[PDB]
Amino acid sequence: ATCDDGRTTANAACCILFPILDDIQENLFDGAQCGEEVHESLRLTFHDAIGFSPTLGGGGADGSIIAFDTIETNFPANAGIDEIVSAQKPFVAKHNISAGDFIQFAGAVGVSNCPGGVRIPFFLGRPDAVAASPDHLVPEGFDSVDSILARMGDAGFSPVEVVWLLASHSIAAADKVDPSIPGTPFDSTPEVFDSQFFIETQLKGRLFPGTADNKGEAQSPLQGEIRLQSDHLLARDPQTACEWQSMVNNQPKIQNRFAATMSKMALLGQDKTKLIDCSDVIPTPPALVGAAHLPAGFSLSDVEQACAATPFPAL
Ligand code: HEM
Ligand SMILES: [Ca+2]
């Protein structure tokens, strides 16, 4: 189909996304940058979608974190999410799409701004949310591995799919884990969707980049990086360690698995056969240029190898 401004997309119902694309690239992502607003929007896709439990309810990727913000931003695991919920709300009021479509659309557009990134498949048509998520369904940085895997398993994700979704922490920082150092990132390249996150979490912890006593924080290997206790444990746990290592220096697998498992997350609570595919509206991401690496001056003896089947690669 050809839309009114002459841009084309495979399914004509998708034409309505083009003005919304332009508005968010200008006014939400500050001129299509891979910056804080993109990271916050990507985190919002997960905090919206994961509100889904067969036994308790929640409609998953349904926009409930905006439509019922009053309730869901009270949950302690949503700390800090209110800023990006407030920022997105006027876009939803002004355009003609549901909050659940908007959150996943903004997350996929945001990701496409980051070098190395992918186009997450995007479907249009989710109805407005009809219930707030239940409480206590969002994993925290201080939860054990078994707790996190049980929660993600309960929403439909295997342990390998959790590892794949955690490539999101390649373009990510924390504001609330240690409030004295907000904006400190989880890897050395928070503007680049690459395997540095899986590398650098495998390094021996050395110091705390701000204060020492913060709940859900492990020691970081670098003054300018922060480490969640969850990522520290998942990189080392026999249930996830070999998968975590396998992402290192494996950008094709990161890209393939992150797109497919993000599309699955974006569809929790929904049925794709009732929606329309508008994947082709998402911009084309830049590619990587630089090779994966240990941080300069580090070597294999600084890596805590945790996969008995396969040694950590020589980078
Ligand atoms: C699986 C267990 C997970 C845990 C325990 C977890 C935990 C966290 C924590 C504690 C933060 C920092 C919040 C702050 O203090 O500001 C965070 C940030 C973030 N998380 Fe996760 N996360 C998990 C999975 C996910 C998934 C599946 C996504 C996929 C979208 C995601 C995307 C993000 C992003 C993009 C940020 C950076 C937000 C920003 O820079 O503004 N996380 N994560
Ligand atoms: Ca939700």
Ligand SMILES: [Ca+2]
């Ligand atoms: Ca990165």
